[PDB]
């Protein structure tokens, strides 16, 4: 709010933290409190625009899902930092002073920021060390098998992470799509026409070893 910004500027120029009493009689003005509460409602709307975000797991590759969840955590922590700022806390304190408890309780709960943060932190172990960078960078069948084994060793850590079973299954489908693309790209470069049959048997033995590992 411009008035809160002006008072914060005035109290910072004096080298002092802001306070509710710095506004004085303006805290009792119904119009000022109504403007602050409308601003807080707008803040709740903007925060809900982010905390309600979700992405279809079937569409897009697994890297897209992991990037989405990591960016969701990155933005949720930024919003959490912005909520603790002196200006927002001063606005909430002023509204609480005028007994406009609706705005404060809604901002505490109606935003859903706490639930979203709890869920995204619960999702943190799975997205923290998701090893698909090795598979996407792998150019040999042995490296692809090693990356697949590492991927499933990391998916072993889904027991202590809350995740929908259907969503995890779609994520495994995405991993399969990436594996198919990587195998297609690797075997395309082998130039099977310009080489003999024993190496072909070796290549298919490696490929079906990868499939059995899957």
């Amino acid at each position: 709010h411009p008035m809160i910004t002006n008072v914060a500027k005035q109290c910072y120029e004096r080298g002092e933290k802001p306070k509710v009493t710095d506004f004085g009689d303006k805290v009792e003005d119904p119009t000022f409190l109504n403007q602050l509460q409308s601003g807080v409602n707008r803040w709740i709307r903007e925060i809900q625009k982010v905390t309600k975000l979700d992405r279809d797991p079937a569409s897009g590759t697994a890297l897209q899902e992991i990037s989405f969840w990591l960016n969701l955590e990155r933005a949720l922590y930024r919003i959490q930092e912005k909520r603790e700022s002196p200006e927002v806390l001063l606005t909430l304190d002023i509204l609480k002073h005028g007994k406009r408890f609706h705005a404060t309780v809604s901002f505490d709960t109606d935003t859903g920021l706490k639930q979203a943060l709890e869920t995204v932190n619960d999702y943190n172990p799975l997205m923290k060390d998701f090893p698909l960078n090795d598979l996407l960078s792998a150019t040999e069948l042995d490296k692809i098998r090693q990356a697949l084994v590492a991927i499933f060793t990391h998916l072993r850590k889904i027991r202590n992470t809350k995740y929908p079973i259907q969503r995890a299954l779609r994520l495994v489908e995405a991993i399969s799509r990436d594996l198919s693309s990587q195998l297609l790209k690797v075997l395309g470069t082998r130039k099977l026409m310009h080489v003999a049959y024993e190496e072909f048997e070796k290549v298919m033995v490696a490929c079906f070893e990868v499939f059995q590992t899957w």
């Binding site: 119904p30 119009t31 409190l33 409308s38 409602n41 007994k99 406009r100 408890f101 609706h102």
Partner: protein, 370 residues
């Protein structure tokens, strides 16, 4: 999500409006519309044909006064729309109506069409995010802080005894009569006419109302005071003239306890209270007698509490303690209750949302109010 809810206790006599959480209603004004009855001749005269609020009181001699409500029922809905617009104007509440949920109050046993039309006006004309038509008596008891008792609310238009048990108003024990402060002031006008002092104009009915509010009392023994020689207290009218009241001083508020003085075969206010108590459960009668809460403006007559206590003791059973509570904030008790209710987070679950009214209509308020 919306701004802080706006409490509007719309009585028949005076509307009391404010924002939820205030200690008292900051925006109280009489519930009538004043229209000028004289000929505007010069440029620079008063602007506007509709005078509501203190502008109507300042120029009271210039205006014909019309009351939209009568006995808690809106008779003129255009005037009611004008008044509720004035509640939101730059003089009162300084805010737009499309942002604040509303907690309107309605007297018990009102017509269904009254509540339906009020909700239609508040959702269509004012485009409120939400609405909640409450009942005055239960709010008054909430304001007192008690959860169980009997609220004998006597306002300008309607008086009613409502027993409440643990916050729930028992609907089969509500007693209501339409004899209230406006009827007492009309009776006072009739008696002043019988004493030679005659008032006709709608603006002079406000002078009669002021005479009622200033010099009128309830005698403990009506028959004893009736037979004795009167004192004839003198009242100074606004123009500077004086009038000697005498016997009309105490026989005017007698109408509350004896409606038969105007030919109505309806119960008295003490009878309303006692019949509301005795219509309830036999288990609750002792605690209802021990918890009686007065409310409304007409309960402010001098000696009202003692007279009502005497009448109730005459009608009540023996060995039953009677405690009539008369809090100082009787005028604003129901508004303070609306403010207390609207402050709670549970009030979010109580209002009829705008979309609910859009999809259902009158049925949404019909289920949500009851």
């Amino acid at each position: 999500i919306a701004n802080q809810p706006v409490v509007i206790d719309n009585g028949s006599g005076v509307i009391k409006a404010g924002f939820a959480g205030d200690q008292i209603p900051k925006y109280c004004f009489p519930n009538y519309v004043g229209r000028p009855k004289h000929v505007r001749v010069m440029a620079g005269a008063l602007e506007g044909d509709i005078f509501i609020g203190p502008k109507a009181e300042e120029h009271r001699g210039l205006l014909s006064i019309r009351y939209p409500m009568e006995h808690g029922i809106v008779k003129d809905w255009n005037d009611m729309e004008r008044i509720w617009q004035y509640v939101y104007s730059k003089d009162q509440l300084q805010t737009f109506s499309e942002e604040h949920p509303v907690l309107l109050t309605e007297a018990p046993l009102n017509p269904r069409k009254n509540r339906e039309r009020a909700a239609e006006v508040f959702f269509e004309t004012f485009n409120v995010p939400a609405l909640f038509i409450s009942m005055q008596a239960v709010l008054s008891l909430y304001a007192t802080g008690r959860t169980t008792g009997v609220v004998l609310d006597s306002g300008d238009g309607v008086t009613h005894a409502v027993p409440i048990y643990e916050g729930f108003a028992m609907p089969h024990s509500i007693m209501r009569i339409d004899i209230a402060g406006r009827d007492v002031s009309r009776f006072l006008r009739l008696y002043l006419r019988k004493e030679g002092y005659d008032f006709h104009s709608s603006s002079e009915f406000e002078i009669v109302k002021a005479i009622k509010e200033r010099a009128c009392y309830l005698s403990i023994n009506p028959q004893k005071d009736e037979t004795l020689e009167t004192e004839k207290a003198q009242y100074y009218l606004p123009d500077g003239s004086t009038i000697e009241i005498g016997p009309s001083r105490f026989r005017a508020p007698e109408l509350l306890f004896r409606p038969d003085l105007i030919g109505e075969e309806s119960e008295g206010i003490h009878e309303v209270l006692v019949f509301a108590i005795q219509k309830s459960d036999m288990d609750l009668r002792r605690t209802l007698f021990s918890n009686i809460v007065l409310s409304g403006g007409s309960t402010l007559f001098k000696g009202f509490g003692d007279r009502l206590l005497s009448e109730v003791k005459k009608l009540a059973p023996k060995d039953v303690k009677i405690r009539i509570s008369a809090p100082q904030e009787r005028l604003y008790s129901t508004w303070i209750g609306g403010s207390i209710l609207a402050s709670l987070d549970t009030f979010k679950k109580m209002w009829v949302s705008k979309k609910e009214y859009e999809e259902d209509g009158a049925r949404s308020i019909h289920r949500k109010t009851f």
